[PDB]
Amino acid sequence: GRLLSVLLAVNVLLLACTLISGGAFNKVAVYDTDVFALLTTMMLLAALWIVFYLLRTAAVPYRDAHAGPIWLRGGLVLFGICTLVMDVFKTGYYSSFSAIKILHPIIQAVFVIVQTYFLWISAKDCIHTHLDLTRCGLMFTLATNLAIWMAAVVDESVHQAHSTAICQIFQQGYFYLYPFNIEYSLFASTMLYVMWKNVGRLLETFFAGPVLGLLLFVVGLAVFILYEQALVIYYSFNIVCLGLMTLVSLSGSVIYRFDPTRTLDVALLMGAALGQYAISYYSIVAVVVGSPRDLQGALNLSHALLMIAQHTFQNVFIIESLHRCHWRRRCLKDISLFLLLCNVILWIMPAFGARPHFSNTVEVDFYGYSLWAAIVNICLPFGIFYRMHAVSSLLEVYVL
Amino acid sequence: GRLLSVLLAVNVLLLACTLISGGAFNKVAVYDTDVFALLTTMMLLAALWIVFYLLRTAAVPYRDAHAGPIWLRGGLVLFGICTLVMDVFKTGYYSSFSAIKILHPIIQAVFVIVQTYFLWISAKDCIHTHLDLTRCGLMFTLATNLAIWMAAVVDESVHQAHSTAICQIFQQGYFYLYPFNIEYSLFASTMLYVMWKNVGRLLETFFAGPVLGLLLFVVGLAVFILYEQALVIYYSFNIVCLGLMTLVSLSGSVIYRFDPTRTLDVALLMGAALGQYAISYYSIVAVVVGSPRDLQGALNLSHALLMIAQHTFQNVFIIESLHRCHWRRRCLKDISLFLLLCNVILWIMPAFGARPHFSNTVEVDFYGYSLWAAIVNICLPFGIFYRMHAVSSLLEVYVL
């Protein structure tokens, strides 16, 4: 049943994985035609099951509470809208001409609309019935989102590596919104998995931190808009933000030392941080084996090490605060604010920034454009997910 | 605790993964020096924990029964000995000259000896104490085996793609035993994971089948020794063996239709079959997008489809028999014998055969030598694992 559903998801996802990675990395010709045909079939079958579930459930005597956190649902709709805009540019590019290539955007739009509505209205639904059928359907939808994710990463790693009409605005706009589509796939997959296990079950502040964060929030805005090289202040600000975050988060852990449903929260928090760990690890290798000891190289190495340290210490601080000061209660409510404001800026740059991010120029010549682009496309969405999860967790700590 | 141990394993394995895949696929120079330094550190720390566990346990009031099946332990020792022989060729190649390169074989030999002894004498041990410390140690050892597995696959996919003294016998012999080392890593990882969850818990035949299998067993021997191209009888025999296996396994399912601790057994059986599914999927793509409709192409496509069908139907037959004929009880004991004999030959060819296997010549020009070799090295060990698991399961069915 559950194992069968898992096996099904894995087996069908494995079939998509070889089709996506076999027809794109072969030598004779790029066979992406069957990739779109299978992807269209997956969403159409996934959408058909979803509407069937909606029709037959218009069952769930008890409702979950932590299954649908607002940050998860909000990101799904925000990236779901971006996926719809991406599909508009998808069809807008198709102003020429194969048939399944044109079909793919429309069926994708229908699937994302239906899936977003279904997840919004059934995020915390504890299905007590049709357990056998729904588990396969939920897992099939989970594999569908991961199949789109895998295809999107491969498609991005091919067009970006290899770099008619007004299409330029339609093409580049379409290719700019891919990370948002990948973000939607990651956001849809985690909530589908949350519902899959949720089947057949019944269950005052100081005036120094926020101002420091707000100026960092304001200065962080002034940095990435400036670039919309010969600049080293982007690294300087990021080091200061990460360095301050590392010390501030660590200090909060010291204060606690001086004086349930969380399992998924830690797993998502620690698991999503692996995306930045991997990027930093590749960055560290590229600077100790590649570029010499220069200003840019030293700045990149310090930025990667500070990213690792900040992720680790913020994670341990959030974990400790989740488990749990006459004058330090206001301080504790103040530490969370500085990190929360500093997490939003560290969310904006990777998400809304350009695909060839500034903070990676050595790992470009060290790993090549294609390999480094693939690594970034695989890992950075986990960084965005971690940023949102950390913002939500810091809001929870402030509430507590 | 358990999650922390998992996180630890994942985090340290992720660090090894980027180091192995970053220092080998970069552009300036192949930085495998730090790969051996980290790998040596991992086993040395893993070996130190294992002997520490052995010394302090020379605790476990109750013993598991299905945790250490004989096929799992036997394969570990068989491939553990092969790993020791591989390490002998490893040091035997080092008849020149860096320092850690020479150290790596010796520490690997110590680690494999200690780990094989530890797994043999503690396969079914239900650790009721030191749960926190042992779980991290078991998971760290699990990541150590996977780190060696990942390094072995990358090392194999690099030397094979790029193709002094008598070393030729020392080098080629060393490079021939890599799949056995990878097999040991897969075998060590699964039993380490079996013990990780086993912490803090208290729990007559007919005369037509065997002769058909025995001649197929004998003929199968006569095939692969012949090659130790212009030959198409290897495909002809494999199709006959797989075709007969597909019909025989399916027929056994029909007879049943006419009239607990297994969760890991199905997961290992179905999960390991993914290795052959992936190889077949890549083979199917290479023949419908690449080579035209020729004798070799049609034979390869039929072989891949028959592999998929045989794996699926054998899996469902084994699963159904695990859940569970006045004159058909002898038949049921006879169906298992034909598949069991036919699984041994289908085990011998991928394991003891040459690295450029005969059954893949199109997926060579379609995917390139490097990509196809990497795919085969990733997937085929799962096929060998599945063959052994199927042999053990068919023996169990014959006993039942």
Numbering used by the authors:
A (entry chain A), B (entry chain B): 28 to 85, 90 to 128, 133 to 198, 231 to 270, 288 to 312, 324 to 354, 364 to 428, 487 to 562
Would you copy out the relevant sentences from the publication that reported this structure?
The otopetrin (OTOP) proteins were recently characterized as extracellular proton-activated proton channels. Several recent OTOP channel structures demonstrated that the channels form a dimer with each subunit adopting a double-barrel architecture. Combining the structural information from both channels, we propose a working model describing the multi-step conformational changes during the proton conducting process.
Its single-particle cryo-EM structures were determined using protein samples prepared at various pH conditions (5.0, 7.0, 8.0, and 9.0). The structure from the major group of particles (3.22 Å) is similar to that determined at pH 5.0 (3.06 Å). In mOTOP2, however, the two equivalent residues (Glu250 and His551) are too far apart (with Cβ-to-Cβ distances of about 14.8 Å at high pH and 12.8 Å at low pH) to form a similar proton-transferring bridge by a simple side-chain movement, suggesting that conformational change is required to move them closer before they can engage in proton transfer. Once protonated, the loop-to-helix transition at the N-terminus of TM6 drives the proton-carrying glutamate side chain to the middle of the inter-barrel interface as depicted in state 2.
